[PDB]
């Protein structure tokens, strides 16, 4: 039953190419619902889910205003951070930002996050209490000293505890058909002959929501972790996800192997065998 809302911000500096890039995206569980792109002609917070289009002019005016505000802050951080590690005005650099909250099956508050990175290495993040900070290096000890005084955490804390959960809860009951669903994987198994003696068995999980899933192979009941080719879970493009796992097996021995499938929408985890 448990849920969550996350926002992602990315800024790649464009030196000798003008205004920095800025992409803002927003999510409920694994369904994206809003975005802002700097180079897009709109200059407005746009709907990416059909259940968010239901909101009025005051909501879009509200999210537009606040989003331009996030953008301009990032425009400044890039130079501040450039002014610490001794970076040239020449090269490009990236700032990343995640914040959001999580809830349970009762929809009541679980936890909040605010993370920050510079150039793919972690930089500064709210500790799990929402009252303190983790500084990844010496440079973000200055950022920490700075934010600690100006009670930045306490603002971030009140949103993440209250306003965040309340908006998440309106969204879940507006996208009841979309967000409050769990689609069991459609599972099946293929057999390809590598040689006259070896054969590939691929175990498939298709059309599931949300993205979380475990696929494993066993032989006679002993896990084949070392011998399993596993792919990263992947979007289908229609709101659902896909995944597979494969083992290379000797011909005749196909009955020794079983595929095991765990999902949020399967009442009993499945055990698949080749005929």
């Amino acid at each position: 039953g448990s849920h969550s809302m996350r926002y992602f911000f990315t800024s790649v500096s464009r030196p000798g190419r003008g205004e920095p890039r800025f992409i803002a995206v927003g999510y409920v569980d694994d369904t994206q619902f809003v975005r802002f792109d700097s180079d897009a002609a709109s200059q407005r917070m746009e709907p990416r889910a059909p259940w968010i289009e239901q909101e009025g002019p005051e909501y879009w005016d509200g999210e537009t205003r606040k989003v331009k505000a996030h953008s301009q802050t990032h425009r400044v951080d890039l130079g501040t951070l450039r002014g610490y590690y001794n970076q040239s005005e020449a090269g490009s650099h990236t700032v990343q930002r995640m914040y959001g909250c999580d809830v349970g099956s009762d929809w009541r508050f679980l936890r909040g996050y605010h993370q920050y990175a510079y150039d793919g290495k972690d930089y500064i993040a709210l500790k799990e209490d929402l009252r303190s900070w983790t500084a990844a290096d010496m440079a973000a000890q200055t950022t920490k000293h700075k934010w600690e005084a100006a009670h930045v955490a306490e603002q971030l804390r009140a949103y993440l505890e209250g306003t965040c959960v309340e908006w998440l809860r309106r969204y879940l009951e507006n996208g009841k058909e979309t967000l409050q669903r769990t689609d069991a994987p459609k599972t099946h198994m293929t057999h390809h002959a590598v040689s006259d003696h070896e054969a590939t068995l691929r175990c498939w999980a298709l059309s599931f929501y949300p993205a979380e899933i475990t696929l494993t192979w066993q032989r006679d009941g002993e896990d084949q972790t070392q011998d399993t080719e596993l792919v990263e879970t992947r979007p289908a493009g229609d709101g659902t996800f896909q995944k597979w796992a494969a083992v290379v097996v000797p011909s005749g021995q196909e009955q020794r192997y079983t595929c095991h499938v765990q999902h949020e929408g399967l009442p009993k985890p499945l055990t698949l065998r080749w005929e």
Partner: peptide, 9 residues
């Protein structure tokens, strides 16, 4: 719904 007054780094 985004957070409002966001602090600079």
């Amino acid at each position: 719904s985004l957070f409002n007054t966001i602090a600079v780094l």
